[PDB]
């Protein structure tokens, strides 16, 4: 892109690499939640996603992930504090790849987010879109098969780095 | 012989529905939220010298997916509707779970146990006698829990399988 | 809205039944055997255009323990009674899960399935035309399968469905 | 002379969790007591060191001694594959009964399993040949990595087993 970012994941399956997911962030549509993700993927404030995990993963569904705070599914800040609002919700879940915010209920954006492995459009208005899968959507597909009905995980699968690419 | 019933956790999110069914199932407790999808457990029992398979389903405290929570209740044989007594709010919620119980079982009858968890915290905000007059006017039992110290956890389903098996009777 | 449904999959030790469930749910297969003590799954599945919630009873295949193997007939809405097609001794067992299914729900129109799993091995004892006649004589459907190639594995869960919605629409 | 003893080290995911000791009716039952005195020293070159207690059922039973497919399916005994049920003359009573696993009329090999509760319903099908002397705590601590359905929340082996004196 001439003016959205891209960041990238290296996933990894019980510290063994898996491959490198990479993400288009629409910081041209919604910039301050792009900025965000963009910003916890570099770790540039001290804090971000390296070392998390994908705790949650639902075959058919998506696979959640971004809590580096209790480390469990439960928690997550953002670069503004603990929360922040939806800033919009222009984009929908039209697809595999869409990457959009995980929350508890309105205004509860923090760090955790899922990668739609289908259509989600149930969530449209509720969760905000802010990105897509660009390379890597085959590891996203491989991820997937360690998940559950139940989204626990057969084989913990972690975001062991991750950055910004030019 | 043998019986077996479907017995469905219904409540706001956070109450301690998983907390409860753990101990029920498990023998334990933790601190650790582990927020649910969905999960199902079996455990024989003796119930009043009446032997049962006793199928959980410990159903997520969210709203959404009105098709598969639909579901859950058209199956489930009686429901535990589970508050918080530290959580205004999830008593205030207890009206929608019977409602919905209600309308997709089509009937006024429906076997069910009111149950205030997390009795063991200094934090109450709902008073016994709130829920135990909520609980009379719906005609069903009311049962305090703490899933922490096992208080009131065998009791709360105990409960609801004699509400169903007083149902069966009418 | 969907519909949930309550098979029981039943046969002899080692013929296939958690092989077959296992390719019906997780569409794999491994040579391990993993012998089973009880296990139950739920699925979400489309079966000609309806949405359906299959609950499924993975039973052993052992023989005793009458009172819990008479409670899983009680519950259960349908039954997949498998055999292998290398094994005449569970062939001719199979009229003791019909007869016993007939005993615990006191009724000769009961839903269930014939079918003969490990069709893919070349070491056959029974020939499809016995078993076809065998459930000709009970009036329900057979089926071959193989849960390693996944012939028929669909065809036969679906099958017993199908059989299922008869019996409670009639 | 004086029925033989022999212990298991039991560990939590190779953690110790502690000892569970056996006296073998070998008075009573000798060919069965002698298999698992001889596959808990390990003298004939194989037998129960690092092996798992794969199933453990609370109210009932701890199962193990699998040491050839490593799956819940296998073990040999030291007369062969299998070897005939000897006799039942003792009943599983009630708690730390030991006891031979088999699939059948004759074909014990090495898998046993340990009473947590009276199980009288095996009785004469499964043969009794000892009992826990010292660690039913530590079988009761076993028995609550156990599940309804047998698997273990943990994986329970026996760590270091052998004949005391
Ligand atoms: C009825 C069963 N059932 C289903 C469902 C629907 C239809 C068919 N079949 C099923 C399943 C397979 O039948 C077993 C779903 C589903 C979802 C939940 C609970 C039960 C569910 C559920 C539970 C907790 C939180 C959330 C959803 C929202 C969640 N928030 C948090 O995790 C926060 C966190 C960010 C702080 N926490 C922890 C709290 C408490 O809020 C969130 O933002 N997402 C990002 C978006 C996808 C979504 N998770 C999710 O997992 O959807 C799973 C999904 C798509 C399958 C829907
Ligand atoms: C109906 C549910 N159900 C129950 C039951 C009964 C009443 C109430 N609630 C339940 C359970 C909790 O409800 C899910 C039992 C039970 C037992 C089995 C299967 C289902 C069962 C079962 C399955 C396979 C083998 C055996 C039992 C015998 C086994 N043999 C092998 O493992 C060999 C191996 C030595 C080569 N293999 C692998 C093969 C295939 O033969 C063996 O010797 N023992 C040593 C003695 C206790 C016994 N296992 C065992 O596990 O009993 C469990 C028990 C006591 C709970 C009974
Ligand atoms: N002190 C105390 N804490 C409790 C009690 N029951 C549950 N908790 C705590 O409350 C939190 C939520 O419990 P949990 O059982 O997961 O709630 P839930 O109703 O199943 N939530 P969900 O709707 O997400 O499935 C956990 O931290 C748990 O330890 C209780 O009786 N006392
Ligand atoms: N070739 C082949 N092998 C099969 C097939 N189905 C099962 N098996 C094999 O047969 C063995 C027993 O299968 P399993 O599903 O465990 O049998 P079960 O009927 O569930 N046994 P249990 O009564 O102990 O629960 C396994 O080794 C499995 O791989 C099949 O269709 N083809
Ligand atoms: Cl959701
Ligand atoms: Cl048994
Ligand atoms: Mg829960
Ligand atoms: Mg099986």
Same mark, same amino acid.
């Given at each position: ?166 | ?30 601190? !650790? ?5 969905? =999960? *199902?457990?079996?455990?024989?029992? %003796?119930?009043? @010298?009446?032997? +049962?398979? $006793? ?43 019977? !409602? ?5 079982? =089509? *009937?006024?009858?429906?076997?069910? %146990?009111?149950? @205030?968890?997390? +009795?063991? $915290? ?49």
């Amino acid at each position: 892109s001439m003016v959205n970012p891209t960041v990238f994941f290296d996933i990894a399956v019980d510290g063994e690499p898996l491959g490198r997911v990479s993400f288009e962030l629409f910081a041209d549509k919604v910039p301050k939640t792009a900025e965000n993700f963009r910003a916890l993927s570099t770790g540039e404030k001290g804090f971000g996603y390296k070392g998390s995990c994908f705790h949650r993963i639902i075959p058919g569904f998506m696979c959640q992930g971004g809590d580096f705070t209790r480390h469990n599914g439960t928690g997550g800040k953002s670069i503004y504090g603990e929360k922040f609002e939806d800033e919009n919700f222009i984009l929908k879940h039209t697809g595999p790849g869409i990457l959009s915010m995980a929350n508890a209920g309105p205004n509860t954006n923090g760090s955790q987010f899922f990668i739609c492995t289908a259509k989600t459009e149930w969530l449209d208005g509720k969760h905000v879109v802010f990105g897509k899968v660009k390379e890597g959507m085959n590891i996203v597909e491989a991820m997937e098969r360690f998940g559950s009905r139940n989204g626990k995980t057969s084989k913990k699968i972690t975001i062991a780095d991750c950055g910004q690419l030019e | 012989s043998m019986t077996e019933y479907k017995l469905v956790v219904v409540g706001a999110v956070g109450v301690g529905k998983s907390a409860l069914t753990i101990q029920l199932i498990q023998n334990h407790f933790v601190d !650790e939220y582990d927020p649910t999808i969905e =999960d *199902s457990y079996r455990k024989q029992v %003796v119930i009043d @010298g009446e032997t +049962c398979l $006793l199928d959980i389903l410990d159903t997520a405290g969210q709203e959404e997916y009105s098709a598969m929570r639909d579901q859950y209740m058209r199956t489930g044989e009686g429901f535990l509707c589970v508050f918080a007594i530290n959580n205004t709010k999830s008593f205030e919620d207890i009206h929608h779970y019977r !409602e919905q119980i209600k309308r997709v079982k =089509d *009937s006024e009858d429906v076997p069910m %146990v009111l149950v @205030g968890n997390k +009795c063991d $915290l200094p934090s109450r905000t709902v008073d016994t006698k709130q829920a135990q007059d909520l609980a009379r006017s719906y005609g069903i039992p009311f049962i305090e829990t703490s899933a922490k110290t096992r208080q009131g956890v065998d009791d709360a389903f105990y409960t609801l399988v004699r509400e169903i098996r007083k149902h069966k009777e009418k």
